[PDB]
């Protein structure tokens, strides 16, 4: 009836890779305050293309070994797109302080997700700087996790409110990055994304790859 071990088998074969190029390889990202975000679902999330692409720069992921992730399947993948100052890259992490952590982006703590970033200087710049990216300097308090504010409402350092028109101390919220094709490494434009893996008590998940194996026939009872 039964037979020696080796006859077990896997792979109810499927395929259909999904839009991770369409977020990593976008021709243009939005800035920090206007950080882009998008739902990804009903696909196999192949990260074995993500790791081994040797064109990323400061690639880490918390809370789970990604290689072990590839079996563990989550849903509601939602991933980001924005760009940061060269130095500031490390500061996008759980429970970290700084300037982005307060006024432009706060990562939820105990976050088990990924932060993937990189250097991009070859395209996100031009002679004199590509002034298409801005960041916030003021806000009344800290930010919640994963929320946005785009607004012309301004801080009032003094007592008298600034009635919309910038003045000596209005401090109009948005200021732009000055990127140069010659500036230092710490000041390069680091084009970055972030994924979060939120399965918010949500049936009908959508799972990922499990690479292969090659059949051997005419051996019974084991599957």
């Amino acid at each position, epitope marked *: 009836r039964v037979q020696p071990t080796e006859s077990i088998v896997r792979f109810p074969n499927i395929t259909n890779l999904c839009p991770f190029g369409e977020v990593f390889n976008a021709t243009r990202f939005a800035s920090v305050y206007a950080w882009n975000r998008k739902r990804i679902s009903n696909c196999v999330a192949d990260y074995s293309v993500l790791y081994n692409s*040797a064109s990323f*720069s400061t690639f*880490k992921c918390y809370g789970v070994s*990604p290689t072990k992730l590839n079996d563990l399947c989550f849903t509601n993948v939602y991933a980001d797109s924005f760009v940061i100052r060269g130095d500031e890259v490390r500061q996008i992490a759980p429970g970290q302080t700084g300037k982005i952590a307060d006024y432009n982006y706060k990562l939820p703590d105990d976050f088990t997700g990924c932060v993937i970033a990189w*250097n*991009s200087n*070859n395209l996100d710049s031009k002679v004199g700087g590509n002034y298409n990216y801005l960041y916030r300097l003021f806000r009344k308090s800290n930010l919640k996790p994963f929320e946005r504010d785009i607004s012309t409402e301004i801080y009032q350092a003094g007592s008298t409110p600034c009635n919309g028109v910038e003045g000596f101390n209005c401090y109009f919220p948005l200021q732009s990055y000055g990127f140069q094709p010659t500036n230092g490494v710490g000041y390069q434009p680091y084009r970055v994304v972030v994924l979060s893996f939120e399965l918010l008590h949500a049936p009908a998940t959508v799972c990922g790859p499990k690479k292969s194996t090659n059949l051997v026939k005419n051996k019974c009872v084991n599957f």
Partner: antibody
Amino acid sequence: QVQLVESGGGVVQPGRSLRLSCAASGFTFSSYGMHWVRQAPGKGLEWVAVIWYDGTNTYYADSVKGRFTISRDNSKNTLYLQMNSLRAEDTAVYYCARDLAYRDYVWRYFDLWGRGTLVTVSG
Amino acid sequence: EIVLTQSPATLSLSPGERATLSCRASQSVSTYLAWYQQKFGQAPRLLIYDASNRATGIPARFSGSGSGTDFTLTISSLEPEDFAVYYCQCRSNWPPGITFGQGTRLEIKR
């Protein structure tokens, strides 16, 4: 105290196996990735293997694809490297190396090197 | 696959002068190439990573520049710790790996 010291240098016949070790000290072992780079006599450096800081996924050069095993056991803070099906070209000074980046997966720079252990093969 | 191309094959110069090496990578890598200095028999030590960052333990006299497929290292004033061999290395995706160069030897005028 921030150093690596290799171990296991020796001679073995072709077709047999040897396993080396690298001792780490002065730093957190389980937070950095580790590499093995081999320097064949009179030649340049040739990367052999890598391991992520949690050793969950590993990469091997083509010349040793499917023949060597890289693994780290943080219990003793020792890196290892096995060999299988050794051939003559494998003679080298195996430098165990340390990743540059702290808790990064890139694994692109070698910032700190073991002194290198002789390994030789002949009948 | 990135295969590193190093020029000139060797350098010969007096100390105190300006030594400039070139490593032209086969195809673009943005900002990721690193320099290794090996004295004869000694242990190679990283000098530059990210192709302009002066790694720790490196006196400020060591400078590098370049991105894409042009990468060069400059030394202002050579003193005997630097008459060595030197390599450029970077990393690859298909098949995933790492490519070193061929090496660049340094010699003294007399």
